[PDB]
Amino acid sequence: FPNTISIGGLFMRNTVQEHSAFRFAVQLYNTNQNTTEKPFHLNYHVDHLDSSNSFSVTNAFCSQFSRGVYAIFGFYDQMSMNTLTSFCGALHTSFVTPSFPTDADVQFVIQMRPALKGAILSLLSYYKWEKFVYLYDTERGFSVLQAIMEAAVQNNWQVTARSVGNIKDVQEFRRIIEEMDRRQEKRYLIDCEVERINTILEQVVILGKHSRGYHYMLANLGFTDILLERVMHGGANITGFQIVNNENPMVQQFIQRWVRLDEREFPEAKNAPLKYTSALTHDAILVIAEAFRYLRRQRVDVSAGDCLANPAVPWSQGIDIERALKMVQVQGMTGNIQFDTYGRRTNYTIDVYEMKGSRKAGYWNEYERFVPFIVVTTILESPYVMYKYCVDLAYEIAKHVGIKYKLSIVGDGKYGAGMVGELVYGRADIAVAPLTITLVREEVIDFSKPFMYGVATPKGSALGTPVNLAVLKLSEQGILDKLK
């Protein structure tokens, strides 16, 4: 058993943050003082890939294999998954990847990104969803799509599935959402790359469908990276997913060190959010270290030939070393880590963050399935308000937003100068009434879209966006026109 272990690193484009994380994690392992914790020195041979020129990928992997490595940690996408995975399988070299898990079953490759199939199916069943839309792409394998279609067949769901991977025009998304609108479909299940998720959310916000009664389910790890700033204020149910839990000791212990790292040495270290891929990279370092520590615990021999063998001369000990990376049980940043005989992660935990501010909504496990945890002002001005239109509009807005409203006549009995004064000074919350729009009033309070005028809300009030969306919906439904 050698006293120094060298492993290779393959990083595709736009992987700077996890490159820094990989370097930081290997440094953390190396700087350990305990002999048992650091039984040997660890070296990392980093490289880069293009994922488009297969010759470049083959040359990089060939250099890594020839120069001599014991394990290869790296990423891959749909373009270069087959090449690297097949070479690793043929060469009997363990390949640790935090990339998307391979839909097909391939040996000698370990993939640490937990599958969303179980959690997504359990949550979908838990919400009593029966008819919905399924927007997807195909850059993370076909596991999710196949599972969703099979579940729909078994449970007689009404799943309208659309692929948006090939879409390059936003107007395509706009037409798709308008079509699902005319079909009245309200529940969406989006599982795409963060970029396409952001584009779809931007398009739907522009069209104005982020209101109560519309659900969303971003079935994609990396809830933080999603630009959901606008949609939150729309008051539309959103269900996300995340693996790392902040409050556990491990994440805090890591991040405390991480925030203080050099910016030049570690790009996107201090000033970037910790993407879950970085967490999985840290877990990769932990699992490799534990596996090799276990190897040295026993007397297993570990010890590189031509790049392309005729027909094949895989060094035997590889089958042993791969087996070592299958029974590992170290509790890393993401939580429990355990690998099935094939390589896919098992016994994992998923945290289902639900929006409404972000708040946890239980958790999902392979064994336990899913376990969860106003004043209105009006002026007594006929015919808008008469002692027994504006009352009907207020009731319609409350219904469309679901808020409990209590009507009242402004004490001053006069317009702003006052009702607007009542809003500004902090009382009466919302206010719906005939208010002539003047540039001065925008300084103090925020209006809604004109409906003949506009509903009034205090500046910065959380109800401004919901009331604006409700007014827009009423205007486009023709009810506002019908009332007059």
Add this chain to the structure above:
Amino acid sequence: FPNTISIGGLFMRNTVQEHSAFRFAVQLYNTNQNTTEKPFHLNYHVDHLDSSNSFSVTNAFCSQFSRGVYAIFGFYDQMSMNTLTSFCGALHTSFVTPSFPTDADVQFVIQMRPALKGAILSLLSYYKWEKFVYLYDTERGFSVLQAIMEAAVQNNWQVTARSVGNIKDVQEFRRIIEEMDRRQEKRYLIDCEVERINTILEQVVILGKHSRGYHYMLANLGFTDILLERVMHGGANITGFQIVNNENPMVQQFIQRWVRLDEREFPEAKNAPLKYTSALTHDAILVIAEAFRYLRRQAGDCLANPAVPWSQGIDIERALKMVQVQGMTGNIQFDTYGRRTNYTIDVYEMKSRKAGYWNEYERFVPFS
């Protein structure tokens, strides 16, 4: 220069007839004793391969390169195109592929299956289509989809573009067809593999929608393989695209010579239709022979650390990319980038009949 030239073969899994046609064309090229049409003997170190295992593809290509080959002929599917095309571009080894045009500009390759997007656009313009549904597949390249999207945007058409191709159960096809029916769509543009085309046609005929007043555009070079029968019933208009003419004496001679071939020695010969891929392969042999003859008249490790290329590969590519030979598919003239330049696609309707010519410089010209 040398009396013998050895080419390499990289036939796919389901290409038995193409293999037989390749061997037959090799025999034709090596049998003429003219001393001018055949100044260099030809040999083929054909090697089979399978997709889904890039290791096998790379190892086979490396072995072929090591054996020493002036030019390589072979097919590639969407899931192995990158490896072969990129190796050939990097190693300066000309690749002749009668499979499908590449979706992007790549040097050091010769795609012959002519791009049919232009003919599709021209014929759609001629027919005055503005409300046609689109059912595309991703197993043949993204060029057609992008071209049709651009045309729809520019020409202000509206097209419903479903994403068939990931569908493994016919119930989804039934749902798609009935949903388009609810939209009263009456014109279809289907771009998928032959098996998917057959499945869609079977589903639509099962739904009894093949009646008159509907037009299916079968945008696939393979027309004979498609089961048009049972769809001509009901008077449903259908249009195809076939490049192999069956009138000129060249194809008649090639057919009459083809049937006599032994079934055992040459499987799928004299007992099956002439897949256009086989004709393209014969044209491949013709063009390779012509380029090598013109060049005459006028080795190492694949994964080399510095990736040093050939000293004469560029000459071979230049010789290949310029040719004006005549084969079954028509006149074979390649553009700078490896695609053909005079498609002469023949448009067939359903009644059957030849309808179109579509020389790229010209436009669609119906026969009166």
